[PDB]
A paper describes a structure:
Nucleotide excision repair (NER) is an essential pathway to remove bulky lesions affecting one strand of DNA. The XP complementation group G (XPG) endonuclease cleaves the damaged DNA strand on the 3′ side of the lesion coordinated with DNA re-synthesis. Here, we report four crystal structures of the human XPG nuclease domain (XPGn) in the absence and presence of DNA. The overall fold exhibits similarities to other flap endonucleases but XPG harbors a dynamic helical arch that is uniquely oriented and defines a gateway.
Residue numbers in the entry: 1 to 38, 47 to 95, 752 to 904, 913 to 985
The structure:
DNA sequence: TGCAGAGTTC
DNA sequence: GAACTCTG
């Protein structure tokens, strides 16, 4: 999820490209959204979609690095819990999804090791790991469809790459900073407004409305939201500019909770500058895996791999 | 599941 | 009249 409408905002700065443009590139990928998602009674669909993607990547000469979600933050859990209160046993559907995912994790990491692709378990948030990889110039981008990566400092992000009718879109920090006037702090304030995976937003704030807010109270860091907060705590009191529209909407009392901006500003990530390695993928083991989990033979997989191994050489 | 247009309200 | 949402 992340910010509810941020992609709509940034689309003016994103450029449509083709998969042939990622040829000379080393990019990070957040697999955690996939297993976060993944009635024909199929076996291991996470692995199925993962395999097809994994092919698509190497076909276009991408050098991937996969990033795995760790312990979700306190604010992420609080957000999903207060999002389920709106929509004894909640603690027993937590410990049954983790043992299913655990196996999904293990199988996916095995598939990766066979394909010769390295990977890193992010200690808490995975988007933050991909972001800090972008920042230290360890990757040359990050393939993800999650807006929240921007708030963790992202500079170059490739979106809609796997979405097949949608064209691959390349987004750059500098581009939408120079066009839209957005920095990391303004985007985090936008996260307070529009709603994100660490905090639900304001009921009626569309994109344009959140920008109207962030311009009505200019400032540095978190000042805009404090000014808007005390202004709405004042103007709500009764004498009964364009600020009337903003009077109308409802606001929470703890707004703004500074722990939210704190979580986006200083997240937890691996600090070391890893030097990464892509090994050669052994063929036989891959067909063995495919039969073990899907039930594919040797020339059922080879019909798919025939372009892939051809491009590898 | 993302965009694009209209419908409904201030 | 324009902007936001909902649905197609």
């Amino acid at each position: 999820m992340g910010v509810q409408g941020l992609w709509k905002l940034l689309e003016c700065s994103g450029r449509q490209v083709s998969p042939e443009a990622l040829e000379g590139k080393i990019l990070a990928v957040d697999i955690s959204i996939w297993l976060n998602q993944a009635g024909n009674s199929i076996e291991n669909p996470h692995l199925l979609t993962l395999f097809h993607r994994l092919c698509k990547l190497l076909f276009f000469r991408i050098r991937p690095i996969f990033v795995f979600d760790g312990d979700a933050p306190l604010l992420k859990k609080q957000t999903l819990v207060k999002r389920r209160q709106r929509k004894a046993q909640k603690q027993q559907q937590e410990r049954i999804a983790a043992t299913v995912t655990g196996q999904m994790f293990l199988e996916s990491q095995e598939l990766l090791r066979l394909f010769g692709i390295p990977y890193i378990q992010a200690p808490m948030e995975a988007e933050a790991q991909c972001a800090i990889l972008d920042l230290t110039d360890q990757t040359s981008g990050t393939i993800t469809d999650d807006s929240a990566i921007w708030l963790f400092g992202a500079r170059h992000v490739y979106r809609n790459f796997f979405n097949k009718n949608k064209f691959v879109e390349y987004y750059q920090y500098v581009d939408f900073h120079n066009q839209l006037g957005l920095d990391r702090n303004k985007l985090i304030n936008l996260a307070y407004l529009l709603g994100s995976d660490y905090t639900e937003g304001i009921p009626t704030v569309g994109c344009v409305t959140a920008m109207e807010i962030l311009n009505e109270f200019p400032g540095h860091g978190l000042e805009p939201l404090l000014k808007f907060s005390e202004w709405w705590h004042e103007a709500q009191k009764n004498p009964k500019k364009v600020k009337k529209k903003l009077r109308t909407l409802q606001l929470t009392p703890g707004f703004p909770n500074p722990a939210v901006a704190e979580a986006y500003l200083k997240p937890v990530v691996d600090d070391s500058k890893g030097s990464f390695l892509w090994g050669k993928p052994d063929l036989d083991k891959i067909r063995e895996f495919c039969q073990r989990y899907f039930g594919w033979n040797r020339t059922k997989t080879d019909e798919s791999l025939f372009p892939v191994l051809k491009q590898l050489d």
